[PDB]
Design a protein around this ligand. Structure first.
Ligand SMILES: [Ca+2]
Ligand SMILES: [Ca+2]
Lengths: 154, 154
């Protein structure tokens, strides 16, 4: 158990779902938690700069992220989804805690490579007072779009 | 200058463009060469197993790959595109030639990591009598699909 802070920074080249634009927001859901960002109107490169805080019980179940086009009068169209795992992040955190302040500032603790078994668009760095994981996610099931976020815990 | 053999092996989870299926084929084009594979009817996981042979003049210009849904009565719908570079491959080839048969069979000469500046879905290996590059490409501008190919030269 712990508290995962997801800083949702921005979307890049998101899909159009309302002809001229989209009104994108993100839903994160982990088991049964569902948290949402604010809506950015008429944008496919939204700068959400929005923080979500997730309560982790089970560090091994994936965290799902979905982008939607907000529309007041109909169900919101999906604009891509991605999953990520926070196992490696939680382990990098345990380590840094057990080493103490002897671990130098700016140290990259772990590099995670994009593969066919994840949604990274580039190598994800776990970096050190705070351990942080920088993620650039390739959205699945959509013709374009990426989301950039940074993870914190706890 | 040289001859690039592109073994187009298969497509994986390609997009639907004719409701129930697609009839996918690939066009490769490098500057002004345009070469096409055979059409696989009613498939989104086509096993093309088809060879294309490209004449390279300029090793630094990208090779573009596009998948299309063949339809006799209308322009063929695009089903994704990708670009790849053969610079690193040609250099791995020069090397193996200059070393000679002292270079062990099965040796991985180069690993190329997926990044936001390429279309790899996983790390691409350049491997040795023949130098070969294995590529798994993530298609762009489409909601799903990958193409697996192997490069040979010359
Ligand atoms: Ca809308
Ligand atoms: Ca068709």
């Amino acid at each position: 158990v712990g508290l995962l802070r997801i800083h949702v920074k921005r979307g890049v080249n998101l899909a159009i779902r309302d002809i001229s634009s989209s009104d994108p927001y993100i839903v994160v859901h982990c088991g049964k938690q569902k948290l949402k960002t604010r809506v950015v109107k008429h944008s496919v490169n939204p700068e959400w700069n929005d923080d979500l805080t997730l309560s982790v019980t089970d560090p091994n179940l994936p965290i799902k992220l979905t982008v939607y086009d907000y529309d007041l009068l109909s169900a919101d169209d999906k604009m891509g989804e991605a999953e990520f795992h926070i196992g490696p992040f939680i382990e990098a955190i345990k380590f840094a805690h057990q080493l103490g302040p002897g671990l130098p500032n700016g140290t990259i603790i772990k590099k995670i490579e994009p593969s066919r078994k994840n949604c990274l668009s580039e190598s994800s760095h776990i970096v050190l007072g705070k351990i942080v994981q920088n993620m650039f996610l390739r959205l699945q099931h959509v013709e374009c779009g990426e989301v950039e976020l940074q993870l914190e815990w706890i």
